[PDB]
Design brief:
homohexamer, 3 domains, six-stranded mixed sheet, five-stranded mixed sheet, 9 helices, transferase, Adenosine triphosphate phosphoribosyltransferase
Chain lengths: 272, 272, 284, 284, 272, 284
């Protein structure tokens, strides 16, 4: 009867999605796989990230937070398997920044594909790699590795990898360079095409609160002891009939340069 | 010479009691069993929850935070053992919500006791179960289990359990239904009858600060751009010669419905 | 030249079983803190530590020469590749005496009967949808699969699916989840497979060397040296050309480790001083 | 029918000791990830993994047929139940060769003398107040007990109590806590006990089967096959009807695993080529 | 090319130095040994505390946060080894409170040194112990222990220890008394003599921001419903042409005693 | 009297190797939860569990009588003390058959040649600067050392140093860090050393007792009892005065555990029924 919501069991997303949900006014004791809300008629489900698109696609669950990377991978696999693939995206969150990018041995040499026309590429996202390669008309053999994909070249397991990266720290750590960005992933909140009776009312309520909480998180109340400074976005007494960000020493210093005195930044719990 | 305070070694209560104490102005580096306060003449003692009532009852310690569940269990056991049982309760905290409740196999059948007149009941709180059963005039055999009590029926170890539960998640997880609530526990701060010389001065100081910190935790400063909205409890400029809670989107939205503009909620660190 | 690559589980009992057996095969190596690629200093060998799921595909891809996996994992990815029209070929060498587990359909304890018949509407939750599909198709029953990669038994409770096919060794886990076992749709043990491609020569020489030592190690585990203060060949038949000389008590080698039951059985026949000594290693 | 239930520690050395011994008794099972109830596929048996404290009471309640516990835990709950006027009866079967520990009264190192006398005012901290009470009452000394379920040695330091009775194997722990051992008030080893009730028949048949294999396993652990390039029976008395034939060197079975000291002693007597080989399993 | 900053791999300092750095406006995803800042041209290096002075001394790194205890130990060892010892201290942080102090068996007897003229002293900081002893003209043998130094007397490993202590809890736990404080350590931010081109500009920027963040951390905005109370440091409307600390119930109560009404304390995110 | 103190690693394979060997030497003790000082109830002994770095210095200081350490750790602190003009003397007793590792200079894989020559400017990162100094000085090459106490291989990547001397068993770790091994500047195994001072008498008696049992344990590990259905002494030379009597098949004791290769070699010579049985313990 209730609204079912799929979330990662483990990882930063689980916490990000738990915390945001808390902020949205959903009361729930920290999860150990099916959780019931005492605040509202909602049930969280904690599962592996990979399982989430398919469950929404199957309509097992109404609602699911996943990375676009995970979402397109299983979407393509199902298409290949001629399996039910349909779903409804609602909102893209500002958490879940990562790229699937082709990386090669540092001191290795190339300038685009058809340098990769024979090589073995190691990936946890073989379908996404296949998509890009096929469209590029380059031919390739995939080495399926679900963990330690960067160690594949060293091992001599494969010639190259497509690895999920946020920043080069991992790659530089594995003695590789990033050569192409073949997918840009952000975490998105999707809906089950054919899992759904005025629970849509609940869904609109959720979506609206998400933004408000986003605003309060981003925004800060400023107080400070001409108009260029007024046009700096600071709002002690703003125009009747608070900054979106303004979170940097530089603009604080920039304000100080403009002659700004008593620069006080306070946290906004919540706002509209 | 100093004021001794018994607290749980491990669990949420330890953190809750540590944090609250911090808020009460007691300076102490995070505990590894006896702790001395540099702020004030106080010593924390970290021990198993079960040991706490008995130590206060023995007067080994002046002061102790425990669940009422733990407190009555050892109180009854000592009575049975004809052991010293006396103590002084001071305050019941708003943390330590749980119930000891009799739970049965789902798809199992009953409608009150004397359906339990022969069954084996598994419990970590046998004295508390005995109290309720005896008063109900129902006869029973107890299966003493100090861990994984919910697995007893499955195992065929016992016919039923009384299990400590906060919400049915655990029970539903173990394929059982809750049938009776035989005890309602909250965490309470008690005092040693006959462990105590103007340290009572210190005790009054502690109790007063607890409430103030409770207020600041609960309460929030609101600012917002007829009287029904004034009677909504919001306090931008309240009547000279701040909300207790007001922490819900609904009332925010309800305020928005009343035409409320620039709804800003800020945290209160501390207040009186 | 090229070194002999062996794919093994990173974590789990198999990894230990495959590590230990390899030790007994005389291959000098040490895990000495987790690392993906390991070299033996005793022999020209590299172990590779990876998820069990990765193993069939790597051998199928020829990334690695040699791989120990559960038959369950092996058929699943074999069928998925076939469906994906991917290279699926490999060479089986030996099926090990360990990795004992069954993929079996389990139902809510209360829910009952048919046990194979019907289930033409209900949702079955599995990590092995391809193996489930194989059995279902052959049974002519129509499925909806709920893909879950862990905690599959919690699916019914959750209302995620009507039924599961769960990997079980004992059934306690199903018993633990308040479900009954209804069918055994696949029987799995660990098997040692080989690359599809050209086996070089001295690599293949090394492979024959490995296989014969593995069997020898299997023999020594199974076989024990016996002595007993016992002329009745029926008791000798209780211990199956075992020789030795000596009322009369002789030192036979038995093929298979004797059971307490058969140990007792000798005692019932009037056997005294039953001494079983362990064989470290042997070669028939 | 009903399966044979065996209560064992969830965690600790005993759990491993009781698991391993059971393995050697020929009972096929695998922990294979923590779970409260375990089934043997070799025999009709279920292990139950629980806190050591729960074990006497479960056997006393008859919830389970069979239980391995420390005598310390066994007497404590036996006396507590008696005090509570609760069912206290059970059947002991065998006392194991492991679980060696003593509940002993220890005092501040500096504090000294009497060591049994007086202590008519001082507070003693214990997890085993009933065992402490037994000894104190018999000594006619008057007590105040400080109940602590862990870190009992820290009580004096804390000023929680004047003295402790602490479970010790070595005393390092007391030495570690800056205390001296003053009395040994109880001597504990692990014992195997049985349900108070009606033992059915084939259950009891299975129980006899278990006990005799356990002893056999005990024998094989204790006993070793010997050979030595040695006609002096005094040396034979150093190895206690051991036979064999052959200056002259023969292959005797010794009852108990020979010590390096006694090994050396043979060397002193002029023994050469002392070969000790392990017996996997045997039956007198 | 970038500014290299050495920090502890593990321990409270790592977190303290990570968090402070975050506050200073350095954007960096939580570290796994070399870290690159996306906010600014900076690289953090995570290493054992012992390695830090030597790396700055070698000029491998420009910048390093270490305890003065660690800093003088390796400084003296290098001097003894006739190794490069030079460096530039910049700021001493208000985190890293500890003392290396000589502690003896409780119920053991002494009143200053030459009671220690023969004894074995166990230490992880043998050079620092040697410095103090030599200057005192007392003779001694050092027992080098890198862990569990307090257990040495009990063991009979050594007659005495010099142990790093924050409060006696550890010592009292090990049945020892503190007899002398032979070094007072605080965590300090030092600079490489000869590791350094207008990156000094970056260094001045860092140092200035550290103080500002220190102020905001310490300071709180107060609002409350004669001049003695005005001279209590509280600042609702202070003199045109906010408290440094004021974080105690006592002064709150003291304010209440002066007749103070509506005492509200709010957190300051950031200020100048 | 004074008890015999033995310094051992708190954590690592050596601690287990030294614990296990000591067990086999007949010394009764149990770790039974981490603690710095351990007492044997079998013999008058105390084990001390400490960082490997602390061990040479404690023996050198005479704090402890007896210590198992890697020669690498032993020479490092020996040289550092010499430089510090600190007491450096000790007595070596035996070098163990375990602790196999090399301190070797490794360079960026791409970077190549000289491999010992030049490096007169480059920075080398090490936890063992004194050992590096020894080798460099003897080579007449001039160094700058980067002291790192862990993750030394990450130094080049970091740009912390130009090169490393890293402790390696296999080289996988260097291979893992994208570096090549260029020189082996020190060869380390675990050795058992002794206090510099006056060895009392009965302590020293106990020490002789320990050393002879350790060797005996070494022998039993190395040596195996053989039987084979084989009159060709060349095959007997394949198994090195081994006796026994019996085409003809006899039970020789071999000094060293036979290899599968030599096992096979017998099979090539026509050997049948190769039975190797483990020797628990023995005394030549």
């Amino acid at each position: 009867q209730r609204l079912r919501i799929a979330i990662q069991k483990k990882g930063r997303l689980s916490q990000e999605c738990q915390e945001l949900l808390k902020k949205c006014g959903v009361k729930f004791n920290i999860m150990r796989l099916v959780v019931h809300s005492l605040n509202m008629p909602i049930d969280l489900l904690l599962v592996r990230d990979d399982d989430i698109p398919g469950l929404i696609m199957d309509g097992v669950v109404d609602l699911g937070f996943v990375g676009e990377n995970v979402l397109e991978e299983t979407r393509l696999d199902r298409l290949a398997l001629n399996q039910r693939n349909e779903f409804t995206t609602l909102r893209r969150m500002d958490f879940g920044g990562c790229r699937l990018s082709i990386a090669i041995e540092k001191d290795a040499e190339y300038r685009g594909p058809q340098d990769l026309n024979g090589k073995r590429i190691a990936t946890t996202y073989p379908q996404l790699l296949k998509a890009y390669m096929d469209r590029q008309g380059v031919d390739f053999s995939t080495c399926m590795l679900t963990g330690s994909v960067e160690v594949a070249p060293r091992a001599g397991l494969a010639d190259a990898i497509a690895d999920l990266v946020s920043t080069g720290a991992t790659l530089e750590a594995n003695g590789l360079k990033e050569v192409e960005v073949i997918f840009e992933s952000k975490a998105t909140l999707i809906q089950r095409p054919g899992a759904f009776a005025d629970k849509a009312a609940l869904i609109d309520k959720l979506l609206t609160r998400m933004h408000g909480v986003q605003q309060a998180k981003e925004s800060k109340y400023i107080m400070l002891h001409l108009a260029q400074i007024k046009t700096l976005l600071p709002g002690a007494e703003d125009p009747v009939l608070v900054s979106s960000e303004n979170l940097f020493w530089e603009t604080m210093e920039q304000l100080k340069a403009l002659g700004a005195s008593s620069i006080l930044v306070l946290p906004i719990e919540k706002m509209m």
